[PDB]
Design a protein around this ligand. Sequence first.
Ligand SMILES: [Cl-]
Ligand SMILES: [Cl-]
Length: 195
Amino acid sequence: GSSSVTADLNNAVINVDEMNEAFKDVPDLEGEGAHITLSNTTAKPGEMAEVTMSVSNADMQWNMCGIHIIYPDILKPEMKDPEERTVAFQKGDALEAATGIVCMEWQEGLPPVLTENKKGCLFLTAMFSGNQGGEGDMATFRFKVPDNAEPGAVYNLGYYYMNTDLFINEQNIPTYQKYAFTHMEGGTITVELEH
Ligand SMILES: [Cl-]
Ligand SMILES: [Cl-]
């Protein structure tokens, strides 16, 4: 079908098959649909590189999210309180109206698909009063690009799907959630070439 082949071609969700399985009994939304995306940027070796998650076609259409962002574990996210595993972030316009936002680094008890592929993970949850979710930039993070990073190196940024993760409206419409998760796009940090 369209939307689960859509998710295979975006290669954004590491456990996409598991996800498609989870959604197998939910028909496709007809038609569109929130578009969640990560950024594609260039950085120098050793740089604190900015990464931004954003969403389009969602203004006033959603109520909360709980999303797992993944990245190569050699990248280290900038931290607010290491002791609490809070990740520093700049909130964008899409989250302007949020009643609460939390963002944490998943450090311990990561699932095999992530550990075995040397992926790190953070979890972003935001809640709104009714359907006041916005659009545009959601959150901007920073990652330490290793000092010794090779020019041209590409760090893929994506998602991990957990059964309880969310991108939903107040009414909890299953097709809405399916669209969002099956159409999400990953991102990249590319290390600049030598001068
Ligand atoms: Cl990754
Ligand atoms: Cl930041």
